Design a protein around this ligand. Structure first.
Ligand SMILES: Nc1ncnc2c1ncn2[C@@H]1O[C@H](COP(=O)(O)OP(=O)(O)OP(=O)(O)O)[C@@H](O)[C@H]1O
Ligand SMILES: [Ca+2]
Ligand SMILES: [Ca+2]
Ligand SMILES: [Ca+2]
Lengths: 127, 368
């Protein structure tokens, strides 16, 4: 009895307006170095939280799980589940979005002011 | 097999049990969900292939019917066999993820939980819906899963990680019904398939040579004229039979249940009806993410046919996408393997401590 995620990254998520990016790495959710935001490995899957300040004092959340063309099944599966878990952690308030390489929504692409970039490769499968 | 604590994943189906280790990309053990007991005397029991091979001297039973457990003593033997004979583990040393069907009765959920903690002394366990795990295995949180196995088919709309129970539909039309139908139409052809051993041969003809026609009426015709698409099949004794339009008439029953004397809608129309039971604002995302799962979705041609049929039922501007992974026989299991490997799942399991404090009803609060 509860089922509260205790992962350090959930504690950091959505605390202030901005963009947060994590990469799935062997069944774990790992923060991406902020100097590398916008460069996505096509062999990997990522989870992106965009937090926007509302007039109201509370924060708006859009969670996007991005799936590289060569990411393995454990990485896309995990990115989708971590998305659900993070949304639940955030009291259901996030709006979830599936982002496929080459087919991302304009909103997601708009988060990267200098233009998102794809690079080949990535972390090996956790299977 | 086994990081720090090694979780196990068991997906129990009406026809087959799929079991293995969390973190593997596929079930290590796949066997028939059949328990056999003496017709006369030794208490004793057999499971899976061994029960089937000793069928003349055993009474064989399927503890799961249409996805639901109907015999708990025999389910316990499946599980005991799974742990000791197939996986070769001591269950008391591993957290166990188990699957269940959509809408599984409340008491059944408690029983599974009780059995794991009181009979097998699991340190931890969890129960997940099979369709939701297949959706996860396909890398989605929103979509509709059409899961079809040996005993039951379901259409299960899911949104932001969770099934929408009011919109789920159940169809008792599945693999077993198709095997039986294939026995009947091959017989009408001029052959004779009626016995238990024969049902096994026919189950294999259905798995190897059947397919879903894109245009059922134009197919009957191509066959009625030409012989070009007939196939040969070798029986266990060396006799060679020829299969003609039975190849596509068999799985056709999924789309036309009247072929089986059934009054129900077919799988395409059940999928549509489930979608139409959901909020209008998520239907585009359901149409756009129709995931097929289960052994009875492995017919060649099925995804193209579902695409054609749902296209005909929905508005012409609706984007339709049918996703049918090559591994969809085991999508359920794989989803469970991913879920149970996550660093963040630690927190999700029911622990023995929680069970000792609240009893079997703990499952209604932890597993949703
Ligand atoms: N290649 C194939 N083509 C057609 N049917 C197949 C194929 N492979 C397996 N099947 C059928 O799939 C069924 C078993 O699938 P599955 O393991 O998904 O069912 P289950 O989980 O045991 O049953 P349920 O989900 O109904 O409780 C059997 O009817 C089998 O004949
Ligand atoms: Ca990778
Ligand atoms: Ca939400
Ligand atoms: Ca099943």
């Amino acid at each position: 009895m509860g089922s509260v995620v205790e992962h350090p990254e959930f504690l950091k998520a959505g605390k202030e307006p901005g963009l947060q990016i994590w990469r799935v790495e062997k069944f774990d959710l790992v923060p991406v170095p902020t100097c590398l935001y916008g460069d996505f490995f096509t062999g990997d899957a990522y989870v992106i939280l965009k937090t926007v300040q509302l007039r109201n004092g509370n924060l708006q959340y859009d969670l996007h799980y991005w799936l590289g063309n060569e990411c393995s099944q454990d990485e896309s599966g995990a990115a989708a589940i971590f998305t659900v878990q993070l949304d639940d952690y955030l009291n259901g308030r996030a709006v979830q979005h599936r982002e496929v390489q080459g087919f991302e929504s304009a909103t997601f692409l708009g988060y990267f002011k200098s233009g998102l970039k794809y690079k080949k490769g990535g972390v090996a499968s956790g299977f | 097999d086994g990081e720090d604590v090694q979780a196990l994943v068991i997906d129990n189906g009406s026809g087959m049990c799929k079991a293995g280790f969390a973190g593997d990309d596929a079930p290590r053990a796949v066997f028939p969900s059949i328990v056999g007991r003496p017709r006369h005397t030794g208490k004793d029991s057999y499971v899976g292939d061994e029960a089937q091979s000793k069928r003349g001297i055993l009474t064989l039973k399927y503890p799961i019917e249409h996805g639901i457990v109907t015999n708990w003593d025999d389910m316990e033997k499946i599980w005991h066999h799974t742990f000791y004979n197939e996986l070769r583990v001591a269950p008391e040393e591993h957290p166990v993820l188990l699957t269940e069907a959509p809408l599984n009765p409340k008491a059944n959920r408690e029983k599974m939980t009780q059995i794991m903690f009181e009979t097998f002394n699991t340190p931890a366990m969890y129960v997940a819906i099979q369709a939701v795990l297949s959706l996860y295995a396909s890398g989605r949180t929103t979509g509709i899963v059409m899961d079809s196995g040996d005993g039951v088919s379901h259409t299960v709309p899911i949104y932001e990680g969770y099934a929408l129970p009011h919109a789920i539909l159940r169809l008792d039309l599945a693999g077993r019904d198709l095997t039986d139908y294939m026995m009947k139409i091959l017989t009408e052809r001029g052959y004779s398939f009626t016995t238990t051993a024969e049902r096994e041969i026919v189950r294999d003809i259905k798995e190897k040579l059947a397919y879903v026609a894109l245009d059922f009426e134009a197919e009957m015709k191509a066959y009625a004229s030409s012989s070009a698409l007939e196939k040969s099949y070798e029986l266990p004794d060396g006799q060679v039979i020829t299969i003609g339009n039975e190849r596509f008439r068999c799985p056709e029953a999924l789309f036309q249940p009247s072929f089986l004397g059934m009054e129900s809608a077919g799988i395409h129309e059940t999928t549509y009806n489930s979608i139409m039971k959901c909020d209008v604002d998520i239907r585009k995302d359901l149409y756009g993410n129709v995931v097929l799962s289960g052994g009875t979705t492995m017919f060649p041609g099925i995804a193209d046919r579902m695409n054609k049929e749902l296209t005909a039922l929905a508005p012409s501007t609706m984007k339709i996408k049918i996703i049918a992974p090559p591994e969809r026989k085991y999508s359920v299991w794989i989803g469970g393997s991913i879920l149970a490997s996550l660093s963040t799942f630690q927190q999700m399991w029911i622990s023995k401590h929680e069970y000792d404090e609240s009893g079997p009803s703990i499952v209604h609060r932890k597993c949703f």
